[PDB]
Amino acid sequence: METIAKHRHARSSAQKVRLVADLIRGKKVSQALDILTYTNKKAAVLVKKVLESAIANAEHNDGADIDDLKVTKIFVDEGPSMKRIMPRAKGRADRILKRTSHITVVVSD
Amino acid sequence: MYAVFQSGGKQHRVSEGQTVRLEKLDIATGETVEFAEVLMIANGEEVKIGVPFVDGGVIKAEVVAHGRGEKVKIVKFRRRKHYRKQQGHRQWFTDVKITGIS
Amino acid sequence: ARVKRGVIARARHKKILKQAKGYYGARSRVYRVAFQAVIKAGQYAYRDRRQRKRQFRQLWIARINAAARQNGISYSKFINGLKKASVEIDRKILADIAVFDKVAFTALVEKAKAA
Amino acid sequence: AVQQNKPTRSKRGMRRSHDALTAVTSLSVDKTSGEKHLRHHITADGYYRGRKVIA
Amino acid sequence: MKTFTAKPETVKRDWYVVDATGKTLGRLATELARRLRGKHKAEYTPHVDTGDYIIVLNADKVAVTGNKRTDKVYYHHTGHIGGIKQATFEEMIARRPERVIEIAVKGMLPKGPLGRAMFRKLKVYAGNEHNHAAQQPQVLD
Amino acid sequence: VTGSGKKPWRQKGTGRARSGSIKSPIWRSGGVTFAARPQDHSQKVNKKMYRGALKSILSELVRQDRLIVVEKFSVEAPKTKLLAQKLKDMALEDVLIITGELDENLFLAARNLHKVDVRDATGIDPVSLIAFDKVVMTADAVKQVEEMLA
RNA sequence: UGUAACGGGGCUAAACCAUGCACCGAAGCUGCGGCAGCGACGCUUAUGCGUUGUUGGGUAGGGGAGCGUUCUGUAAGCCUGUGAAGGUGUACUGUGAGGUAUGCUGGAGGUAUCAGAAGUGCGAAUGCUGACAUAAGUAACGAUAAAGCGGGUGAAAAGCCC
RNA sequence: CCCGGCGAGGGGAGUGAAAAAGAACCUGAAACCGUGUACGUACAAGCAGUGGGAGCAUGCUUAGGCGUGUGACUGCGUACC
Numbered sequence A: 001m002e003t004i005a006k007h008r009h010a011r012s013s014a015q016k017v018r019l020v021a022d023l024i025r026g027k028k029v030s031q032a033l034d035i036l037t038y039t040n041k042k043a044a045v046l047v048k049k050v051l052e053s054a055i056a057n058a059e060h061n062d063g064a065d066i067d068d069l070k071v072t073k074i075f076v077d078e079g080p081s082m083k084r085i086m087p088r089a090k091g092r093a094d095r096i097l098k099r100t101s102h103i104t105v106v107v108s109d
Numbered sequence B: 001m002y003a004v005f006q007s008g009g010k011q012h013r014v015s016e017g018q019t020v021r022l023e024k025l026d027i028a029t030g031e032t033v034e035f036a037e038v039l040m041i042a043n044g045e046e047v048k049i050g051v052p053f054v055d056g057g058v059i060k061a062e063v064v065a066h067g068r069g070e071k072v073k074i075v076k077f078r079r080r081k082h083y084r085k086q087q088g089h090r091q092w093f094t095d096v097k098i099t100g101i102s
Numbered sequence C: 001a002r003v004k005r006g007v008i009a010r011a012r013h014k015k016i017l018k019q020a021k022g023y024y025g026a027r028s029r030v031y032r033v034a035f036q037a038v039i040k041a042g043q044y045a046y047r048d049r050r051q052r053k054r055q056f057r058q059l060w061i062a063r064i065n066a067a068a069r070q071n072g073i074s075y076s077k078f079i080n081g082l083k084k085a086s087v088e089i090d091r092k093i094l095a096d097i098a099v100f101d102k103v104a105f106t107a108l109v110e111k112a113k114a115a
Numbered sequence D: 001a002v003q004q005n006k007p008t009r010s011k012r013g014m015r016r017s018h019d020a021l022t023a024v025t026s027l028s029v030d031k032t033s034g035e036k037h038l039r040h041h042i043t044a045d046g047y048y049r050g051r052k053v054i055a
Numbered sequence E: 001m002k003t004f005t006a007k008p009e010t011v012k013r014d015w016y017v018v019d020a021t022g023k024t025l026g027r028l029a030t031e032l033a034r035r036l037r038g039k040h041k042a043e044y045t046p047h048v049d050t051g052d053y054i055i056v057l058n059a060d061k062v063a064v065t066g067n068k069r070t071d072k073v074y075y076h077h078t079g080h081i082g083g084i085k086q087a088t089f090e091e092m093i094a095r096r097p098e099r100v101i102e103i104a105v106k107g108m109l110p111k112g113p114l115g116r117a118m119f120r121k122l123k124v125y126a127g128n129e130h131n132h133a134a135q136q137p138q139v140l141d
Numbered sequence F: 001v002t003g004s005g006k007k008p009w010r011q012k013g014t015g016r017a018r019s020g021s022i023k024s025p026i027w028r029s030g031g032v033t034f035a036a037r038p039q040d041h042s043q044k045v046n047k048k049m050y051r052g053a054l055k056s057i058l059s060e061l062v063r064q065d066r067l068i069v070v071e072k073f074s075v076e077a078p079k080t081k082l083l084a085q086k087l088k089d090m091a092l093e094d095v096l097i098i099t100g101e102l103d104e105n106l107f108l109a110a111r112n113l114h115k116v117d118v119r120d121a122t123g124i125d126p127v128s129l130i131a132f133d134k135v136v137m138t139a140d141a142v143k144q145v146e147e148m149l150a
Numbered sequence G: 001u002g003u004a005a006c007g008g009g010g011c012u013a014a015a016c017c018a019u020g021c022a023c024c025g026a027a028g029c030u031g032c033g034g035c036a037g038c039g040a041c042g043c044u045u046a047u048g049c050g051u052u053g054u055u056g057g058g059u060a061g062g063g064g065a066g067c068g069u070u071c072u073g074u075a076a077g078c079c080u081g082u083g084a085a086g087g088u089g090u091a092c093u094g095u096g097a098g099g100u101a102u103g104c105u106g107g108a109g110g111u112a113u114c115a116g117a118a119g120u121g122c123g124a125a126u127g128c129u130g131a132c133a134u135a136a137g138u139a140a141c142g143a144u145a146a147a148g149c150g151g152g153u154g155a156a157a158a159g160c161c162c
Numbered sequence H: 001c002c003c004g005g006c007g008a009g010g011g012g013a014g015u016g017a018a019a020a021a022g023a024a025c026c027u028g029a030a031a032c033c034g035u036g037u038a039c040g041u042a043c044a045a046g047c048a049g050u051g052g053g054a055g056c057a058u059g060c061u062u063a064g065g066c067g068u069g070u071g072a073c074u075g076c077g078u079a080c081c
């Protein structure tokens, strides 16, 4: 089994979340869950909740067993950006992109 | 074993048995050709030439195929002078299998 | 009769971007950049069919000049020696013989030495 | 100010080569409870060096 | 029909020694660069380093015609604000006698990865002794 | 196009492409450069050319044997069932039944039949004579067409 | 700014003057294929050739012959849930615009031939609209009046409540 | 049902012919951003290709080699309008 879980429309850019996701890749689920406790980043909380989902996801529905589970594929795709106007000096306007990310985790054995 | 001969305005260092691609001949698909334009024959003793061609040396071969080569694209283009041109080219060939270095 | 041109244009761009396959950066991705690369490639290809025939002759001539000087004759004198003995064998083969069958090659240098 | 012409994926990546942040890989274990935590930090429950020093 | 090219793995490279005592710098350097490149060999391929390893010994005794012992100058820039250094042919032999043959050959080799690869082949020495006895380097003239 | 003649922005000063109108055909949602006007595509044909063409096509039907000349051709009552049933004996399907005396009974009875068409001898056409696979002319209709084409 | 007035190495011949055969050397010329334009032409036949000369760099520009697109007639025909258009690959094929067949996706339209008509082909117009990059996880987070700690609530508290 | 904050969001289960038809809903191109496999890449100078070409990796017929991807080294080569 593979057993996917994923946060879609996760409020944080890919480039930031992708920094955390590179820590956990082909690591044992129990070891991965620890790291994100002591990774001082917003995205670590956001990625943890997906992994922690994927494990229960895996154990309830399909595979069972927590000990033999590795994060086989983790990836972050860029989601829809939300456009907002930032007014600047001298009358001109900018467009801030409130970005989002699609975080996926796959917990196989 | 190997011998040298001239065919399609060019020469080939050919051995007995192996296939050779050369320039198109006015010959049927599965007939036979005799080259009496043999330039050299090598063995233990080498029969080289102090004249054009050997003497009684004849390379006998059998025609295998009559295909067309890979499509070469030709692109002419004059920078800034509103001129370019396209042209394909597939050259005709004749594969021949050698069957007698005399 | 209005004519939408999305189907045909795509097929035009996709054709060129297929030739640009392998190129670095935008040159493989971006029609506007690729199209230049693909023409330039054509231009260089056209010129290099001319240069291939030159390069190989230099290559052969060097090989022949090397293999001759092992037997004690320079290229210039060797070729005149062969021409004066009415030998019709070309550089392409002399260069092939030079590498493969030196015991044979030696006989051409002797044949040239006569003249 | 201002780039002369736009940099690539490649350079953007080359620059980001050092942005990859390092993991801890150095979790402790409390002598009494056996709870994992950062070195020289207290635990989540409230232990340090096998002795309660917090309500 | 695809003409022969020398395959690096199959290249059997040979070792040589050249005594440069009383040899003309350039006329030596040429014959060295011809060998290092592998032109003398009948399996010469321009994109492969087919040439031979050469040991040039007694580099300091190399001869030069005319007034080039004093008059020939070897300029070089330090890459600095105004740092153009020069050294005459005597001054060069007094300090670094290896550099003389090195520079003369390097100018006559091609410029690039392979040109630098075929310079590595060359082994220059001031003295008459060489520590490459292990290769049985044969005598060349 | 609906919209004002006003320049959206001024000629110089802003780092933008000089515009003069929202309605310009290079802009979106306004223009079409050479907008079509309702027009008449009807083209002149010389009487002698039209007659010559009819004389040409109507004579090729005789060579190809599409032209089936007949005597009196008329259905009993205004019913398609009868017309369809009588064409089975005649061995026809896609036809142009030309008649001098245009019977309403025959007309009505071929209105619903797709491959059959019942023109009057006066109202023969170039495209029709070519289009249909056979042409059935009444002896009176041949006499009228003869005089009409002349 | 750096040798910096042989392109360099380097050379007393690898310079110069004279003669002499060699060789290298271009898309020049010849060799062997293949295509096309014009002129003859045997007189085949209104044409291609036993053929035969000759030509075939090209901006502005002039003259020829074609490809493809949407639509109308041929078509209430033909191909299509035993899988259309579209998308995406692969393999053939033509001198080119292109064409043909088929794998996957798609889930319903498509259209031979020969004619007809064009909103008929885009890389540029500081073109117009939408999308997405770059700089960059950079600058900045808006007055230098100032915070601190305990408790509460909460999944979470520097900011909320006391 | 299950993870989550009796959230968002997901995994199941089910409906349907189909749910990468699940409401951000036919098709779903390109730019652009990713994850995994093969090769190359940390002494090497420039329109980034092009002729040449080793190696390595795959597909095949095999007791020759020929495709495909990569492209070390090397001759030539200053984009388009």
Ligand SMILES: [Mg+2]
Residues within 6 Å of the ligand: A009, A010, A011
């Ligand atoms: Mg949000």
Ligand SMILES: [Mg+2]
Residues within 6 Å of the ligand: A012, A016, A017, A041, A042, A043
């Ligand atoms: Mg973050």
Ligand SMILES: [Mg+2]
Residues within 6 Å of the ligand: A062
């Ligand atoms: Mg299941």
Ligand SMILES: [Mg+2]
Residues within 6 Å of the ligand: A078, A079, A080, A081
């Ligand atoms: Mg986006």
Ligand SMILES: [Mg+2]
Residues within 6 Å of the ligand: A086, A087
């Ligand atoms: Mg603001």
Ligand SMILES: [Mg+2]
Residues within 6 Å of the ligand: A087, A088, A089
């Ligand atoms: Mg401001």
Ligand SMILES: [Mg+2]
Residues within 6 Å of the ligand: A090, A091, A092
């Ligand atoms: Mg303003």
Ligand SMILES: [Mg+2]
Residues within 6 Å of the ligand: A091
């Ligand atoms: Mg204001």
Ligand SMILES: [Mg+2]
Residues within 6 Å of the ligand: B086, G096
């Ligand atoms: Mg073209």
Ligand SMILES: [Mg+2]
Residues within 6 Å of the ligand: C002, G070
């Ligand atoms: Mg339409």
Ligand SMILES: [Mg+2]
Residues within 6 Å of the ligand: C009, C010, C013, C014, H029, H030
């Ligand atoms: Mg496209």
Ligand SMILES: [Mg+2]
Residues within 6 Å of the ligand: C009, C012, C013
């Ligand atoms: Mg186009």
Ligand SMILES: [Mg+2]
Residues within 6 Å of the ligand: none
């Ligand atoms: Mg594509």
Ligand SMILES: [Mg+2]
Residues within 6 Å of the ligand: C021, C022, C023
């Ligand atoms: Mg490629």
Ligand SMILES: [Mg+2]
Residues within 6 Å of the ligand: C022
């Ligand atoms: Mg490649």
Ligand SMILES: [Mg+2]
Residues within 6 Å of the ligand: C017, C028, C029, C030
């Ligand atoms: Mg693309």
